[PDB]
Amino acid sequence: QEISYNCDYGDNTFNLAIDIGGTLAKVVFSPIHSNRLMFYTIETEKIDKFMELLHSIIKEHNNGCYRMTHIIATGGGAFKFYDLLYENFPQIKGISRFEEMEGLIHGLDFFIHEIPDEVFTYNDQDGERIIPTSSDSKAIYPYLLVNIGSGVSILKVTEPNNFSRVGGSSLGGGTLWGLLSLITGAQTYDQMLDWAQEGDNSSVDMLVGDIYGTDYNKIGLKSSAIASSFGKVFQNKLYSSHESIEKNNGQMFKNPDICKSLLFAISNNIGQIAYLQAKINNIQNIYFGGSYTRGHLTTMNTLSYAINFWSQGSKQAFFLKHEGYLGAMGAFLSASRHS
Amino acid sequence: RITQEISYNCDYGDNTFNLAIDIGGTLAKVVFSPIHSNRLMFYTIKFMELLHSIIKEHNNGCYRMTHIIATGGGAFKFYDLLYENFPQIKGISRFEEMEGLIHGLDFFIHEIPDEVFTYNDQDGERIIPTSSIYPYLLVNIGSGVSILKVTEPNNFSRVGGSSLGGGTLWGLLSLITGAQTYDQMLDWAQEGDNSSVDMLVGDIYSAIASSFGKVFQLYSSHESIEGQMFKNPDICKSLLFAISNNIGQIAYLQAKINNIQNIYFGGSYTRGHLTTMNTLSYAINFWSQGSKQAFFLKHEGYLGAMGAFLSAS
Numbered sequence: 001q002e003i004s005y006n007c008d009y010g011d012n013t014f015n016l017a018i019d020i021g022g023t024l025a026k027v028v029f030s031p032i033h034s035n036r037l038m039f040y041t042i043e044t045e046k047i048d049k050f051m052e053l054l055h056s057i058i059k060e061h062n063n064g065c066y067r068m069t070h071i072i073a074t075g076g077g078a079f080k081f082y083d084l085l086y087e088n089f090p091q092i093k094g095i096s097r098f099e100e101m102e103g104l105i106h107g108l109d110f111f112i113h114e115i116p117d118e119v120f121t122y123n124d125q126d127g128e129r130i131i132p133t134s135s136d137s138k139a140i141y142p143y144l145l146v147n148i149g150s151g152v153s154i155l156k157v158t159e160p161n162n163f164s165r166v167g168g169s170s171l172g173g174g175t176l177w178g179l180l181s182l183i184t185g186a187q188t189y190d191q192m193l194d195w196a197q198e199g200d201n202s203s204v205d206m207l208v209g210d211i212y213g214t215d216y217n218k219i220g221l222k223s224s225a226i227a228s229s230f231g232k233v234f235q236n237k238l239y240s241s242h243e244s245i246e247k248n249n250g251q252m253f254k255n256p257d258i259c260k261s262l263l264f265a266i267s268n269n270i271g272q273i274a275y276l277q278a279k280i281n282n283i284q285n286i287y288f289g290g291s292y293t294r295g296h297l298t299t300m301n302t303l304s305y306a307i308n309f310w311s312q313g314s315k316q317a318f319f320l321k322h323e324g325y326l327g328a329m330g331a332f333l334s335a336s337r338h339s
Numbered sequence: 340r341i342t343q344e345i346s347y348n349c350d351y352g353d354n355t356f357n358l359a360i361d362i363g364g365t366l367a368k369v370v371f372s373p374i375h376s377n378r379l380m381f382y383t384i385k386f387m388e389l390l391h392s393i394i395k396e397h398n399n400g401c402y403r404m405t406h407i408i409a410t411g412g413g414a415f416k417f418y419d420l421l422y423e424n425f426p427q428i429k430g431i432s433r434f435e436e437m438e439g440l441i442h443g444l445d446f447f448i449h450e451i452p453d454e455v456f457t458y459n460d461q462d463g464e465r466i467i468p469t470s471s472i473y474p475y476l477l478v479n480i481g482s483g484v485s486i487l488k489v490t491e492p493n494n495f496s497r498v499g500g501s502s503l504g505g506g507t508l509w510g511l512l513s514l515i516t517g518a519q520t521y522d523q524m525l526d527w528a529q530e531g532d533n534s535s536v537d538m539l540v541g542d543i544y545s546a547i548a549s550s551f552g553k554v555f556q557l558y559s560s561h562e563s564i565e566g567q568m569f570k571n572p573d574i575c576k577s578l579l580f581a582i583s584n585n586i587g588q589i590a591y592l593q594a595k596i597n598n599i600q601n602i603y604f605g606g607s608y609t610r611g612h613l614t615t616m617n618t619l620s621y622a623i624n625f626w627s628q629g630s631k632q633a634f635f636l637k638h639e640g641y642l643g644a645m646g647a648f649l650s651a652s
């Protein structure tokens with residue numbers, strides 16, 4: 001989903017930035033004199049596949065010129081994969097590392113300030129609205145980045161170059177993916193999202209309605225609000241697997257319903273934690289980064305609604321067209337300055 | 340057979356057998372006192388059938404001298420069912436759930452010795468002599484989580500909550516592992532090693548980076564997608580940590596927003612399990628750098644029924 005941008009190509013080094021996380025590798029590069037920023041994601045699980053993509057990019061977009069390629073690695077996996085990269089690319093110009101936080105924030109601020117049609121709000125009522133951020137300091141800052149990958153990172157940015165980590169969560173995309181993979185057999189994240197879309201969570205969640213007979217207006221909750229995620233399930237050997245889960249249980253619980261339930265559980269939790277962090281830090285604007293929302297309308301509506309609800313309208317969820325690429329973009333910009 | 344009991348000089352001015360019931364999503368709790376016994380009797384659970392036996396055994400089968408106070412959603416969802424089930428009773432009344440919990444908690448704090456305690460694996464159990472306070476948070480964990488702020492006697496509000504509560508833990512672990520009781524889940528959790536299903540920091544580069552994050556790792560023309568197995572004990576530990584750490588974090592953030600140091604954990608979640616208590620205590624101790632404190636309660640599951648009981652008189 002390439003972007004037009006006038007890059008400074010410097011000494012013509014080909015800068016190949018990689019953000020390596022728990023689960024995914026996200027790559028940003030610009031062929032020399034193209035003025036195009038290009039973006040790819042691949043799972044890290046099959047090393048050959050990952051390394052092979054990097055090889056193909058060098059061959060297809062830098063004419064096989066290893067000796068003028070600089071790989072800059074960011075994300076948590078920059079450390080773990082450093083030796084794999086070195087052994088794969090003996091003949092390249094260099095390999096460097098960029099701190100994860102600076103990566104995310106440099107990448108995000110770049111997207112906010114420079115790239116049109118990149119930042120957007122979304123909910124089921126309003127549809128998508130592009131926020132024209134790449135048109136000052138006091139309008140943009142302060143903000144929070146909620147970067148959802150395997151876990152959840154939360155960073156606050158008070159002004160240019162002024163940013164820090166605040167507490168994150170271990171209940172992130174990896175949790176949602178792990179649980180639904182094992183429970184439902186779903187083969188890909190995209191499949192889980194399609195099943196979630198069709199599902200009815202109320203068959204496995206207890207709603208306020210199920211516990212009361214009605215709204216619980218004294219505490220601000222409608223009957224349709226979720227009171228206990230997966231709360232309906234209990235009432236109704238060393239190892240478990242999808243197989244055993246299916247043999248034991250059949251279709252008492254339906255896959256679409258499980259997917260929607262847990263999509264709501266994890267996204268609402270993330271939205272709440274984000275809210276609470278924004279509340280403590282007196283921040284109105286909350287960006288979502290990572291590869292969790294993937295422009296999925298249900299997911300974005302869920303997150304937007306959680307921030308809106310918990311804040312009673314005083315805070316706002318923002319999404320990014322290149323959400324997954326913030327870290328790699330920041331690394332890219334560092335290597336660019338260098339060359 | 341009642342095995343949980345407190346001596347207390349109850350007020351029997353009305354010459355009524357007060358029977359308080361907390362009808363929550365998943366569990367039902369009773370608090371009652373045989374007239375003039377000075378014994379408070381507690382029971383957690385075919386339920387309506389229990390209430391009958393209680394009247395039979397502890398009030399001589401006398402319906403016309405029994406008063407029921409109902410708290411929780413059942414009280415409203417099923418107000419009629421109580422009248423259908425308990426005709427000819429002296430009276431049925433209701434008590435609002437949040438107010439139930441706080442009156443019950445304040446009673447345990449102020450009146451009952453050896454009720455409030457800290458627990459962690461480092462220093463063990465410490466009884467806090469509260470009965471010898473404000474403001475405080477109550478984090479009441481049942482099917483879901485209710486979080487209440489209490490500034491002073493009779494000043495409180497529900498500030499927050501979470502749908503990721505005991506029912507989520509029990510639900511996930513039932514379906515995934517086939518475990519049949521909360522007890523088996525906790526026993527398995529205590530043996531388990533979460534690192535086989537969780538991505539830890541070390542995995543990305545013993546803190547958890549992603550709970551359960553290691554698990555994900557046209558027409559038919561090749562082999563069946565068919566698969567990988569994970570150990571039940573490790574799954575129970577992963578999800579116990581995930582749900583407990585999250586609750587601890589939300590509790591800490593709420594406490595921070597509300598400028599509260601003292602955080603009480605209520606409901607039927609910890610059940611006196613050292614591992615669960617340790618995890619909650621650790622989470623609060625960690626985030627606050629020691630400036631906030633987790634408290635537990637010997638009668639954690641009966642806060643709401645206790646408050647309802649006291650409302651009768």
Ligand SMILES: CN(C)c1cc(CN2CCOCC2)nc2nc(NCc3ccc(C(C)(C)C)cc3)nn12
Nearest residue numbers: 211219220226227309310483484485499500501502
């Ligand atoms: C997910 N939403 C939208 C929210 C929002 C809030 C706080 N809001 C702040 C803004 O003003 C309105 C209130 N609290 C929430 N708690 C839950 N579930 C836990 C839960 C809900 C209900 C119950 C009973 C019925 C048994 C008492 C027990 C546990 N969800 N939830």
